[PDB]
Every structure is written in C-alpha cells, then in structure tokens.
Design a protein around this ligand. Structure first.
Ligand SMILES: [Mg+2]
Lengths: 429, 441, 429
C-alpha cells in the first residue's frame, strides 16, 4: 500500500528510531500496549503503512533492529512502548564493530547479515505494495554503517524497485567524536553514492545550535534531538499517511527533487522551533514559518545555503490553511533571494500540504531543499582522511581488517569526483 | 493600518513605559496575560487595539513596543512582574553593564553592542505592521543609555525608514532638582545629535509633576509611580484619535509641520488636566471652560518653563469625551482674549481642535479623580529656550573646568563634539531668538 | 435625465453627505434596506436622478466617497442607512493628507485619484443625461480639498459640459481650527475660481449662530449642522426632482444667477428655523419666510449683505401657495432695501416654486443670493496667509511637499485680483 519498514543500526541511530516510532505512536494515539485509544479512524485508515495489526489488535511496527551488541536491544527493550514491539526483530550482535567499518562490514559485516536479511525478507512478504523502508545509522563509523552498507547493497539488489531513503549521522567539522571517522565515512560514502536512493544529512552541532539558540535550551542530549529529527522524518510521509489538498510522495519527491541520481544527499528544515515564551511574542502564519524556512540556522546540515546555491528546494506543509497564501510566499521567496536559487531550474521551489498538521500544532512546515553547499563537508572529511592517510594513522587497526588501501583511493577520487561534479552543476548557467 | 510602536530606555524611561502599557491594557481592559475577558465581535469602521496590542490566533495580545537599555536589573522586574504573560521574550532586549551615565559609553562604547539586535526587532515589528505611522521612543537624559544609546537609535532608525513619524518622549533635566551633574554632558551631547535625528518631541520635567500632583492631585509624598502614572495619562490621550472616535481625529503626521511650523524648534509643552481628587471631583463641576482656561495656567504648566515668559505658537487641545465644538470654540476665543499671552504673530492662529468622544478612564489605585473631559495642550512657544540657556551655562562653566571630561574622552568622543555641540545650542538659541522676533513693518 | 452624482471628501464633508443622502432617503421614504416604503409614485417618479434601482430593487445612491484614511469609511460604514449603500464606492486612503494640501494633492493627491476617477467614470456611463454631480469638502486644508482639487481638474476636463456645484467649508474669521488654512485655502481657491462651476460658502460660526440664537440650541455638533445645510442642498433640486408651477434648474439657476463666470461663490439662506415653542408664537406665510429671507442672521456666510450689495438674489420655494403672493413680496422686497440691490441688474431677484415643500413642512424657502460682501472673507484669509508667508511659518511642512512659493504668489495676486474684481462690479453704476 506504499507501506514501509524501518531498519536502524548506529551508535545513536538505534536510539533514534526508538524515539521515532515513539512519536508515530503518539500521532496514532495507540496505547503502549498496542491497541488504539484515539478518536478518529483516520489514524487507523492509513495505520498499516507503518504499523501492523496483530491477532488481537497488537499493533506493531515494521521496524528492523540492527546492532552488534545487545545493549541497545536491552535499552529500547527497556523502552516505554517496549510492549508495543515484536520480540522477533531484536537482531543484534555479540561483538560490536569497534567502529572499524571493515569489522562491521566484513568481519561482523558478513557474520550477521544473513539472519537480518532473512527476517527482513519475511517482512518483505509482509508488505503488499511496499513503497519502501527507512534505514538509519551514522556515516562516520560502523555501529550502523558497518552493516548498513551491506544492507543497502543486499536489499538494493534484492529490491531494485524499492526506495532507500537513508539518514545517517555526519561528523561535524569541529568536534571529532572519533578520528577513524574519515575512513569509515569515505569507505561508506563510496557505497552510498552508488546504492542509496535518498539521503539527508545528520549533524549534531546543528542540533545543538537549534536546541541552544533557537530552542533556547541549555541541556542537550540525544533524545530531544531525535525528537527534533523524527519530527521531520515523521512528517515526510504525512500525505502518504494522510489526505492533502496538495500531495506528493517520496517518488514524487525525489523524482521532483533530483536532477541526476548522485544528488540524494539533502538538507533539512523543520519548524516552528520556540521556547515557551515565544508564542507570547509571536503567532503562526504560513509567511512566518516561511520566514523560518530559508533560515541557515534551521539549515540543520554542515552546508550553507548562504554560501552554496539552492539546486532545489521544497516545502512540506501539514495543517489547514490557504494555499493561496502558500504558493504566494513560495514564489515570493523564490524571487527574494533568487541568487541562491540555481538558474535553469525554473520554479526550483515546489509545494505540498497535508490536511492535518502534526499533533499539538496547527500548521506544519518542512524543508528538504538541496543546494550544493555540502562540498565543504566532503572536502573537509576527505581532507582529514587525506592527512592521516598520508600518515596511514590507524591503518593498522584498519589493514588488520584485511581491506586494501586502493579501496580508500576508490572512495577517495570517487568522493572528490562527486564534489567537483557538484561544482560544475553549481558553476553553470 | 494605523500603527505606532513604543521604545523604552533609561531607568525612569522604561518606568514610564511600564506605567503606559499597564494603562492601555487597562483601558482596553485586555487582561494582563494577553486575553480579553470575553470574545471580540467582528465589526468595521475603525481600528481597535490592533494598533499596539498584538493579535494572536488566541487570547494573546502583546504590545507593539520594545525595551532597550543597558541597565538590565529593573526590566527583569517586568520579566518577573504580573505581565510576564503579557509581554514577549523577544520583546525584551537589555544591556548588562549600562552607561554609568557615560553618554559616550552606551552611545559609543556599549553603543556598538546591542544595536543590531534592536534593529532586527524593529524589522520584525514593522514588517509585522502595515500602516505604522510613527515611532514612540522613550528614554531619559538620566538612565544613561536613555541619552546615549537612544541617540544612536534614532540616529540610525531615522536613516532606516525615515517616513515614519518620530514620537519623542524623553525627560529633561529639572531646573534645580536633578539626578547627577554630568547631565549637562548627557543632555547637550544628546541634543546636537538629537535634533537632526528627531522629528518632534516633548520635554517632561518632574518638579512640575511633584508640585502639581501634590496640589492638584493633593499628593503628600509622590514618586515615579505617580509620575509614570501621569505621563501615562498624557500619552493615553495624545493618540486617542487612532484608537477612538472623535470629531476631528487629528494625527501625528498631521501635527508635525503644523504645530512646529519651522523645521528647527520642534519641541513643546504639555499640561494635561483635569487632575483632581475624589474630594475635588465632588465639590467641583469641572467645566469645559474650567479645563480650558485652566489649561493655560502657567502654574499648571507641566514643564518648569514659564509660558507667560514665552509667546505661544500652536495649541492642539485634543479633548476626551463629551466636548462641544462650540463651547471649546468660544473658549479658544477666550484664548485669543488673553492679553498676557502673545503669539508668533506671523502664525496668527494655528489651532487644531481635537474632540474625541471617549472621556477619560481612571487607573484603580490612582490619585487622579474621574471626569468627563480631557485636554492635552501640546503647545509650542518661545519660552522654553531659557532653561536650555541655563543648561548651556551650567555645562558652559563645568565644561570650562574640564570636569569629568576624562570620563568621556576615555570612551571615544572628541572635544569639538563638546564645543561644537555648544555651537548647536548656540544656533538653537538663535532660533528661539529669531522666530520670536516679530516680522518687521 | 439630469440625474447627478455626489463626491465627498473633507474632514467633515464625508460626514456631511452621509447626513445628506440620509435626508433624501427620508424624502423618498425608502427603507434603509433599499426598498421603497412610501405612499406616492412621485418619490419614485424622479427617484433615479439621485438614486439607482438595483436588481431586486436595491435602491442606491450615485455617491462617490473620498477619503485618505478609512475611518470615515467605517464611520458611515457604521451608518444607519449603511445597508442602503453600494460597497463599491468606499474609496479611501491608507495615509491621510495631514492637511498639507500638497500632500493630498501631489503626494497622496496623485496616489489615489486613479481608482476614483475610474469608478466615477463607470458612474458616468451609468448616467443617461447627467445634469451633474455634487462635490463636498472644505476650503482650508486637504482632507477634502487635497484631492478634490484634482477631481475638479480631472472631471472638469473629462466632462467640460457637466455642472460642478461645489460646497466646501470656509474657515470662519474668528476660530482657526488650523493655521495652515490660509495656504491650503489659497492654493485651492486659485483652482476653484478656474474650474468649479458653482460654489456656496460653508462657515461653521454661522451654523453655530443659527443653532444657538435662531435655533435656540445650546449643544452644537456637526450632525445637526449637516442637517441644516443638507436641508438646503437637498432643496436645490426639488423642481428638478419634482413638479413646480415655476421651475428652474441649476443651469437656469447659475445662468440666471451669474453675470460672469468668476462669481460662483454664493451665500445661502434656508428657513424656517424655530425652536418648538415658536409655532405657538408664530405661523407661516410667504411674506413671513420672506421676512426671514433677507436676514443677515440666516445669511449663513462670512459675508454681510448689510455691508455688501446684492449682486444677485433668488428664492427657492417648495410648497403650495399663491405665487400672486410670492412675486408680490419679491418685488416689494426688491424695493424695500433697494440700496443693497445692485443697480443695473433690473429685477435682480428671481423666483421659483416647487409644488411640494420638503417633508414635515408645508412651505419651503431657500435663498442663494450673491452679494459681493465676501471680499472681507478673501481679504482676511489672504491677510493671514500674507502674515505667516512673510514669516514662511510652516513653509517647511509645505516645501517639504515640493511645491514652489511662486504658486502661492499665483493664487495670491490671483485671489486679490478676484477680490478687486468684485470691488469694481460692486463699485459701479
Ligand atoms: Mg541604563
């Protein structure tokens, strides 16, 4: 039915989806136990395309657990809504990748892929007209990417018609949570540029910036952050989940978002984002949220539209309004800062609306535009990879996995090729 | 459609602002949180609160005004006060370390520190607004940012929009009562940088507030509560036309080059009445003529500069409540009648009536008694130059002794700013000197 | 059909016409809703020449709204009979003239004339044989005159055959409601002497004098006053609206009133004017109302027939009487005070009668004579203009509009020229 599935690895991402399904449960108001306690059939109408009824009305996720060590499995296993799960999917590891990506990709990569792809495949038979599935990990290591690389390869072959919308955490330029990041990252991204269908960037520092400045929060954790992102990743299917006077699916999205298949790394904007007092400063209009939409500070990725140029831009609106406003602000904005709008893409802004906003708010905005400002991102990470690969720093942890360096060259001149590729598209008219 | 917005600075200044928005919110009776007690019916013919109280998608109606000052303690009291549901966080911009009453500090030194935040807020409101006529800016030559930082504020805000009106409420150094001694420096350094960035503005002095509240309000022992209440009334009525039906709903821009005929000497007095007690509310009748004849009592003059020593130029006796065009009109004949008064004859009459039909509303806990009719004598004469002259003579000597100058020179101002600004009051002394000259033959 | 239109600006005049159409509605007894509830077809016979039927019998005015700020538009929009209007004509401003006449004439003058003259022109096509139209503002500022100057120029060119009967408020000599009055006034009157076809003087102090002395009223407002004037301005078209044994239209009037086109500033008298007790003092005769007709106290203008000389004089009678009386009093009076009758104009008094008086009264009188006593009026206002123009007092508000002073000279020696012009005609035989 255009239903989809979720698969998460990732040192964080395993938590991320926990929050995610948590949020969707709220938007479906079904008890933690797994039965519905809401007030409209509309939550039940399209419930299946994420959930699954069970005998007795156990309502369940179409999620897939990735992990190389059960702790997360216990963690979310210790999770509220944990009784809303299926024990089947608790597919984890006994070792951990140690985030040498070769470890999580050959060593443990080849070790535990099979049981996953089997049960996942059983989910594939459980899906009537599968629009797709949602993968989640991080692009700097192996706790997610280790195996998730193998996932994208295997299912991608196994389902060359299905959509692969991939969110994985990008290392911020400043803070290096690990120094093996350039290598895991580069080795992964070689794969992901080939095999993944959609990708959107996952920085932490942006999420900090949001929580601290625009959220005006002092205490950052993951969980709030995954609230902030699963807000958007939860919004994305809204029309696909719920009616909309102007609907567009991921196929309409990506096909209406990408000129050439190498450009499915997208940046993200969601809003509104206030602290409590703000409403008693300000109110909500479509033009208002628009005035956030093109905010670099909501630009939750390491790329700057202020520095790069919008190759593409789009808006995901959930609520009840007048599109006569919506479009009007659209075109207005597409003029107002025309210069950061790429040229030969006429009407490079594109529209949407969901008859219902997310719960709690009256109107919704989402922006997954695609400039080319990410070039500094790849340039950076490739740069650090370059330096220590001059040094071969921690190659020994690496070659101990029994990869070659020439692969590193492959993702290397590879990833540079993708960058310059974005250069010419940005530098053209 | 018809918007204005208020800006607040200096200790006394934002004191005034607090009193004001307390007032207006009382007067439209929208509860302090941001809701009205009841639903608002859909109607047309004129605006309402929408000028200043900000519509939400619900009972949240915040002012259209902004706080800015580098002495952030007291404003927090608003940040704490009952109206902490009223106001809005981004409505609040303060500095931590204020000027220390260095004009040159919050104007120069700390002048650099918060400006951009201010302008962004301004853009948010004016962008939020449509037919914003003009700008309500409040500050003080005492709470030092009230001079310095405000000086940059209009200095740039004018250059931003320009076409808006400048509604200037700031306090002037009381003639013999004071707050400090660098006040000469604050004032005149403000003034030469004030004038060409000002459209028009009035000068409120306190000692009048004291003397008159104590006699006319029968006040025994007043303070900024009473003062801020009083200016609260006067501004409460100076803009009613855009808020309430009146026969001649005159407007600010209307006031501008008509009250202040020339460009230069564009300030004025303002003696509101009728301020009386509950025991004088009774034992009295409070005629239109009483408010009217009473309106020109030099002893009623709400800024300590003798009108009888000056010659009037204009008088915009905007009136609240049950006013009669005729009755007031003949009173204006009575004002032509006053031998002691003398007018810039080349402007024989320049009068401009204001008859707004709502009589005044009173603030509970206040000292003013309730009436049926209000007057605002925004009038401009020759008289007010003198106290200026005191300011430039006092400042003249003190500056001659180089007193305190180290403080300012330490913060990035040059001496020719001082002597030249004295040339500024020189010129304005030539202005009140000249415009008061009767045109020959 | 000799139908006509109304156009009002003016700080008051916008109210004035409100009262006016209000009064005419009474004389047509049509509901506020816009359908007729009267008792004779005669109200319907000539109804069109002010009104307009609508589909379903919405009966509507041929009025034109001038304003530079919607408050009045809301005001009368809040008006009883407000449902008798057409929402189309609510053409106002977003600024207000501030009564610097250059503001309302160039600045906002040029800003909003277009939408007016368009829709007005649509009314011009709505008019079969348009006798004219009625403009209303004041001659001291810009709230009316600001734009109304442009109206008279534009339509005057646009309709060089139509009658332009112009009433605008004159500043009384004593009370200066504003001090920029000489300048707005003079600048306007330069135009009006050239372009306007009829004008009658609108003082306030006269209206006060009427209400207080002869009305014996203590509480003056506008609205009563506009009752007193829209009484007359409502009478003027009576024959044109209703049969009359002795009829005369505005063309017959002005052509039968003016020797030379510069003399279409006329003074006004209407009556009877009593308080309630008076009828139990006195009764109504043609000779009686005649005995009011030549009353300086009904001379509702700043000019004194007692000081000047009747260049012309006329009577507008609505009722049912014997003209054998009427004429007899006419000639009688034309003798009785022959000296204030200009000489070489034989029978300088002229006659009229409408078969019906206005509602409520049995007989009607109106006097729009034209002496030359107004010379003190222009002399005064020009004088004050002279003084402060020596001073250039509030030139800065003025030249800030970007006019020249030489224009001020133009209306200046202009208006003086018109005055002395009236001097020679008064001083001649
Ligand atoms: Mg301070």
């Amino acid at each position: 039915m255009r239903e989809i599935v979720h698969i998460q690895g990732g040192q964080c991402g395993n938590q991320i989806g926990a929050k995610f399904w948590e949020v969707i449960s709220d938007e479906h108001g079904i008890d933690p136990t797994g039965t519905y306690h809401g007030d409209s059939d509309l939550q039940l109408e399209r419930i299946n395309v994420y959930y699954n009824e069970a005998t007795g009305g156990r309502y369940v996720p179409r999620a897939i657990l990735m992990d190389l060590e059960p702790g997360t499995m216990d963690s979310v296993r210790a999770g509220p809504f944990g009784q809303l799960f299926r024990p089947d999917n608790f597919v984890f590891g006994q070792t951990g990748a140690g985030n040498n990506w070769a470890k999580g990709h050959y060593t443990e990569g080849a070790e535990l892929i099979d049981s996953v792809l089997d049960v996942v495949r059983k989910e594939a038979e459980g899906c009537d007209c599968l629009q797709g599935f949602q993968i989640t990990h991080s692009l700097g290591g192996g706790t997610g990417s280790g195996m998730g690389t193998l996932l994208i390869s295997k299912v991608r072959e196994e389902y060359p018609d299905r959509i692969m919308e991939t969110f994985s955490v990008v290392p911020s330029p400043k803070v290096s949570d690990t120094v093996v990041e350039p290598y895991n990252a580069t080795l992964s991204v070689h794969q992901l540029v080939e095999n993944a269908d959609e990708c959107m960037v996952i920085d932490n520092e942006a999420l900090y910036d949001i929580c601290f400045r625009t959220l005006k929060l002092t205490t950052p954790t993951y969980g709030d952050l995954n609230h902030l992102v699963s807000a958007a990743m939860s919004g994305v299917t809204c029309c696909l989940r719920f009616p909309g006077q102007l609907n567009s699916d991921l196929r309409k999205l990506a096909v209406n978002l990408i000129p050439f298949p190498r450009l499915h790394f997208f940046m993200i904007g969601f809003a509104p984002l206030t602290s409590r007092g703000s409403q008693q400063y300000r109110a909500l209009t479509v033009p208002e949220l628009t005035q956030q939409m093109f905010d670099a500070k909501n630009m939750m990725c390491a790329a700057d539209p202020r520095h790069g140029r919008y190759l593409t831009a789009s808006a995901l609106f959930r609520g009840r309004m007048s599109t006569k406003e919506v479009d009007e602000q659209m075109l207005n904005v597409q003029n107002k800062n025309s210069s950061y709008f790429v040229e030969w893409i006429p009407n490079n802004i594109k529209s949407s609306i969901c008859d219902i906003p997310p719960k709690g708010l009256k109107m919704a905005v989402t922006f997954v535009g695609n400039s080319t400002a990410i070039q500094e991102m790849f340039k950076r990470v490739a740069e650090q990879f370059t330096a220590m690969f001059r040094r071969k720093a921690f190659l020994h942890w690496y070659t101990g996995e029994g990869m070659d360096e020439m692969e590193f060259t492959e993702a290397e001149s590879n990833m540079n090729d993708l960058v310059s590729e974005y250069q010419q598209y940005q530098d053209a008219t | 459609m018809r918007e204005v917005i208020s800006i607040h600075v200096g200790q006394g200044g934002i004191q005034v602002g607090n009193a004001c928005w307390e007032l207006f919110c009382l007067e439209h009776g929208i509860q302090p949180d941001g809701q009205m007690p009841s639903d608002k019916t859909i109607g047309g013919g004129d605006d309402a609160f929408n000028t200043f109280f900000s519509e939400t998608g619900a009972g949240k109606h915040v002012p259209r005004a902004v706080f800015l000052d580098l002495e952030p303690t007291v404003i927090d009291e608003v940040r704490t006060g009952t109206y902490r549901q009223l106001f809005h966080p981004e409505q609040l911009i303060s500095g931590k370390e204020d000027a220390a009453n260095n004009f040159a500090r919050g104007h120069y030194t700390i002048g650099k520190e918060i400006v951009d935040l201010c302008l962004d807020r301004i853009r948010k409101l004016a962008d939020n607004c449509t037919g914003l006529q003009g700008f309500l800016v409040f500050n003080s030559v005492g709470g030092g940012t009230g001079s310095g930082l405000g000086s940059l504020l209009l200095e740039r805000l004018s250059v931003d929009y320009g076409k808006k009106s400048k509604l200037g409420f700031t306090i002037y150094p009381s003639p013999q009562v004071s707050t400090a001694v660098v006040e000469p420096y604050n004032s005149i350094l403000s003034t030469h940088s004030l004038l060409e960035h000002t459209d028009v503005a009035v000068m409120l002095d306190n000692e009048a507030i004291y003397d008159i509240c104590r006699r006319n309000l029968d006040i025994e022992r007043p303070t900024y509560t009473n003062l801020n209440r009083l200016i609260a009334q006067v501004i409460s009525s100076l803009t009613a036309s855009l808020r309430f039906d009146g026969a001649l709903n005159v407007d600010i821009t209307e006031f501008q080059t008509n009250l202040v005929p020339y460009p230069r000497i564009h300030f004025m007095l303002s003696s509101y009445a009728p301020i009386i007690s509950a025991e004088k509310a009774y034992h009295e009748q409070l005629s239109v003529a009483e408010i009217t004849n009473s309106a020109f009592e030099p002893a009623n003059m709400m800024a300590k500069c003798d009108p009888r020593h000056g010659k009037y130029m204009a008088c915009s006796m905007m009136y609240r409540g049950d006013v009669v065009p005729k009755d007031v009109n003949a009173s204006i004949a009575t004002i032509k009648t006053k031998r002691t008064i003398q007018f810039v004859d080349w402007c024989p009459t320049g009068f401009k009536v204001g008859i707004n039909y709502q009589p005044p509303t009173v603030v509970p806990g206040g000292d003013l008694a309730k009436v049926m009719r209000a007057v605002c004598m925004i009038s401009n004469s020759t008289a007010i130059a003198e106290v200026f002259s005191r300011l430039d003579h006092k400042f003249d000597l003190m500056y001659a002794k180089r007193a305190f100058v180290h403080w300012y020179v330490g913060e990035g101002m040059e001496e020719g700013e001082f002597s030249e600004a004295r040339e500024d009051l020189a010129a304005l002394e030539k202005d009140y000197e000249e415009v008061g000259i009767e045109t020959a033959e």
